[model samples]
Target: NPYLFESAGFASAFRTGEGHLKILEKFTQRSELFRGIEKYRVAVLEFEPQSFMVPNHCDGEVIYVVAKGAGIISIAEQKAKYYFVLKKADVKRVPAGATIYFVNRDANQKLVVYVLVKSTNAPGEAQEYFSGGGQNPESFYRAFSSDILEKAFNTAADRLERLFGQQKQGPVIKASEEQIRAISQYASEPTAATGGEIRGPFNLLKGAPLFESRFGQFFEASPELFAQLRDLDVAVGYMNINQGGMVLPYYNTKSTRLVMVIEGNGRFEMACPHAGDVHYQKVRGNLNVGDLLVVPAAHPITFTATGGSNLRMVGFGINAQNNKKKFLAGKQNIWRNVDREAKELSFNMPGREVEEIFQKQDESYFVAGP
Candidate 1:
């Protein structure tokens, strides 16, 4: 059985490496990773230089982060190979149902990476089919056209062709019934002043007496006011607001946060964990809202809404319930701490440099529209 972590400040269903690798039959990690949060999974991967990892299949969609090193990533035969000369902190996403491989071009350094995925089930398993130093083009052709497997292969091929040709498509499938319920006002039970109301996790914007702050323009859900319930084991808050100009910064905390912008444009900056207040990095783009941003525990980061309107996004935390006490106890402004730490760490956005970054045409980084 999986354990649960609970505290005034954060909460999460406990999971071990064995759970992640799906070692136990009938044991599911879905409730732990996706409970209270939307559909997503994140992992960090490291690959050695001049070597390669084989083609593998996933049950759902996936993406990769080129945290360090560079190489070639190919999806199928006749499909163009994406040759990336990656530096530290670059990111890329792979289409669903696509088999992908990596080759570490650099001879002296190892290729370190991160992967974010949308799984059919939480703790989704990876099934590797082939492994070798390089692509076997003949094998790819034979496998994709075999009469016994041709129909599935053809369908996948057609989708890949369209995806690569025009990558900025919106959600390929409609939101699930559960997801729609989470966002709808009717499904969310309202509470009276005497009795606390029950608001669905996604319906944060509706039923507020009045919108008080200008900041509300940045989020679709009204920033909710809820107290911890018996030190929850895990908790999550979801947002769908548009952001522009300057946006709020999140404070360092014990919980880990993973944010995905389902739609919009922006630049994200985070304070360096080491080297004390000296270095920082900014990721800027006309970012597709679905791209996932993983923030490690106690890392300070800020967002600048850069487009015509406010940037809309959703954020999930690994141990939100454990930090509620700290939030309630601290009388000082949390945003102030965020801004101060961010500034002291030398975080800045150079508009011209940002423009140059967006000018490059790369389908892997293109944002999908609704």
Candidate 2:
């Protein structure tokens, strides 16, 4: 189904000695579900320990989540700079045109970061401008003549050539412990402070979950909770569902949520009416770790963990302003508020019958899977 994208669906966007970047097909260029959806590009960056990513900036706003390992990220804007320690579950935003770089300081673990950038140039495309690099990720300065570069930097031609031609390693490369330690010195803790355009990273795992039960737990990094997420107009969430448990069927009023399976196995069922012949197409699939699925706005969908393992997922909500999740069956089901006459006519049955069915479940959000 167009809604589900398997792990193998991703293509290698970039590969180097230290790491690689994997990306799915551009959203708008794909199925109808992604058409007219706010344009954004998502990528997975994985780097081995003690590696450094060349300094670069994008033509669009950037937000990233540290999916695995710990490291340090440095961002330089107009006149201010930020250096933040990175850890799993941390989320940060980088303004457009800001120079940014990353370092995987861990001695032996891999660092994995998930990046989401809004496309500003073309439909479903974001461009990266590298400030310093050579060979693999050629520097923009190389486009200039040696005479111009010499005048630009007030340096000699031979020195300029040596500077621009030495970095044979691609955009990301292995780094020495001495180099890593020197970079780590600038790293600092982030706080929820104000008065600056740039903000510190927020650790999603540090906050209490929105809700929890014996069956599952839901954690969120919302604009309401993190000011850094406000202007981005997006929210991040992580869900953990125990084996044989499922979340209630629900739909968002204004957001389209893209979810990636982080661990275990699960199945998702979505009710979509955008099919040509079928009035309501039942789109469903089984997903494993690394698989991705998009739940379009207002499409009712549900998830269930199976195969004797808990299901863990990380998701991003796009266009998330005043979005309200409306459940179909539960203590807070929207139908519970409908008048008797409207309910009877809508279902073409007695209101009492619908009320009895709705009362059968006492759970508000989650329950045991069938």
Candidate 3:
């Protein structure tokens, strides 16, 4: 039904190319959704039982959100294998060079993951290395010299070849029941991180609410709840607005913003520059699932829930500044900081009129609509 989503790119299927897969669909990583975000990629992965993503390491950072279903995300570090227990709405951060893979252990439900990548280690691109198979690069065993390999690892060249090159399937393949059990065991007491404790896998559903206004918001990390990854420069937030509710006009001072509509309906009103007009252009559009909305720094935008249902959204901050965002017309509205004399000289209005105009509303953050 139309309730699935009405957004533009969110409903888009897999990217057409060599590395494309039916189970994985990537959004605009370099297009409108990714303007100042040059080093990252966004994609949705569908999880399966028999086949899971193969062991691969990325040059950039990755934050994964379990959009739906239940699964296990295991990361392989130096001496430990960290098996993360994942359920719907759970979020995990995989730092650059972390050898990671995902598995959907759900018996009957669905498993889908929305992930964001930051390519700080490699600008404008992300490198994913598969162990082996179809259309993928040649395995290290096949690419390396047999003579050199024999001495390097003190192993037979033939043995190395079979180990690296012999694979039955591509990157995403089904797994045995035993493998799931093994992974389950790891989650029981998974000690994947070295030396000390690892940070959080922030579950968005966990009610460590940042606040309760007309709309709900969550920031980078929670001391009482989720621990944000120290290595990653991005953090996501959830916004819940009821019908006729407004997020109000807001702008980021330092970072580029990308918002994904998870549910309900809404529209974005952004200020655009016009060549000859004295005022800025007011661009508007409807929001639906899979729709990726980009809000560049200083481009003030207003988000409003348009339909009968509650509007739910997730915001991705590139070069993140967490909850340090500024408002344009709410209680925390930054325009309130404007000089008193300027208000009189610019708008060409009386002092009393100026106060009555902007100070009419006491609410400065999330204001409800009429």
Candidate 4:
């Protein structure tokens, strides 16, 4: 079944096949929170200096967020080129089905980047094809050195002139690998240990079981949690909610949300502002271990677990500016209602069923536990 939430920490290394470059994917179809949906994959790519990726095409569009270094993206039959001098946190988007290639301009530093792609199908596989730089050696030569290669290829005069005029400036190369290594080795900055503390309501102390209140509800998943957090304007804690055979209440929200299901089976529902409501059913078919669900801002939704297995997931908010304020404003009542409901539900429910339902609204009624 499709998962409710999934995520993975940064990976230091990744594997690749012969002639393919390596990339460390912190999150993908294999991430902890998203298991089922395979329509897309989010990953981080680290390109070795002076290296080039083979030209490749996929059925879907791809976006990139450059985290470090610089590179050049070549596309459209090598007729178009875009030079990117990426520092930290630069975002770039590439249209789907576009044949593209990557070249690391910085010979010293690794080109670190984050990539997001819309796939043709959920759990889609990445297919790579090598072009040996460019498919046409004649085209490459004419593009790079028109005057020299044109005579060799015996190109028509008009065509040769057109090729020379059409040649675009290549990417700028900066910093050799040896120079970068030397700088790193001789850096004089002192290595200092620094410690600071952050305060939040969800701090349950290390090794402490996330309080039952934290789970919120089954089928509710990460999207609903995101909405509540957005409404409250608080830094939502990342924790597993209910799993397996639970139904969460329908709720409304005013913020965009992203959720990945790490484990378990379930389906989600959203009340549409337009015609019919959007239902993500067939839990096993709609999602898997690495699927992600994006809820637009200001939408109403609900979730229903489909399997007997426990549904586990994690969630966090995108914007943090307004979160704390909302949480603090409702702190008193949140705690009061949560405590009251937990007591009432525990007393009334026979086993797991009622507890599952109570958990949803009950958790929503209180501040996150300490």
Where is the poorest 10-residue window by lDDT in model 3? 16-25
Q: Which predicted model would earn the best TM-score? A: 2
Backbone clashes for every candidate come to: 27, 0, 12, 41
Q: TM-score for all predictions?
A: 0.34, 0.93, 0.78, 0.36
TM-score of predicted structure 1: 0.34
What root-mean-square deviation over C-alphas does model 2 reach? Answer: 2.4
Global lDDT for candidate 1?
0.40
Compared with the true structure, what per-residue lDDT tens digits does model 1 show for residues 1-370?
0111111112122222111111111113423333433444544455554544445545555545454565445454244333333444343445556566555555566565544445555544433343221222112333444353447555555554443334221111122345433433332344343333211112323354121234333222111333321222222333333444433344536655566554466666665423356665443333453345555455555556666766654544555544421111112233223443344344355544433343342321112222
lDDT of 4 by residue, 134-213 (tens): 32211233344656666776786677556444422221123355744443443323333333211111221123332234
> Candidate 2, residue 203: CA error in Å?
1.9
lDDT of 3 by residue, 1-370 (tens): 1111233334333332111232112233334543456665666666654346667776777778776688878788785567777877778888778788777766665576777777775465666765444243334445567888789789987787667765645556666778877767767883445555445476776755554574544333422223454455565767777678887677777666666666788887888553454787787888876566666667777788888887777766766644356776655566578777877887899756886777776775566764
Model 2 clash pairs? none
lDDT of 2 by residue, 1-370 (tens): 8878787888787799799988778875666658755477677889998999999888887888888899999988777778888888888888888899999999999998887777766667777788889766888889999889989999999998888888878989999999988887756544345586687788776768877667888888877667777877888888889899998888888888888887799998999988246687899999997788888889999999989799988888888878778889988789888878888898898988878888898887778987
lDDT of 1 at 290: 39
Q: Give the TM-score (vs. native) of candidate 3.
A: 0.78
Root-mean-square deviation (CA) per prediction: 20.4, 2.4, 5.1, 13.7
CA lDDT of each prediction against the hidden true structure: 0.40, 0.83, 0.63, 0.41
* lDDT measured at residue 127 in model 1 versus the true structure, 0 to 100: 34
List runs of model 3 lying over 4 Å from the truth.
Answer: 1-35, 49-51, 132-141, 145-168, 176-178, 190-198, 205-208, 222-231, 274-279, 338-341, 362-364
Give me the displacement of residue 236 in model 2, in angstroms.
1.7
Q: List residue ranges in candidate 4 displaced over 4 A.
A: 1-36, 77-81, 121-123, 133-370
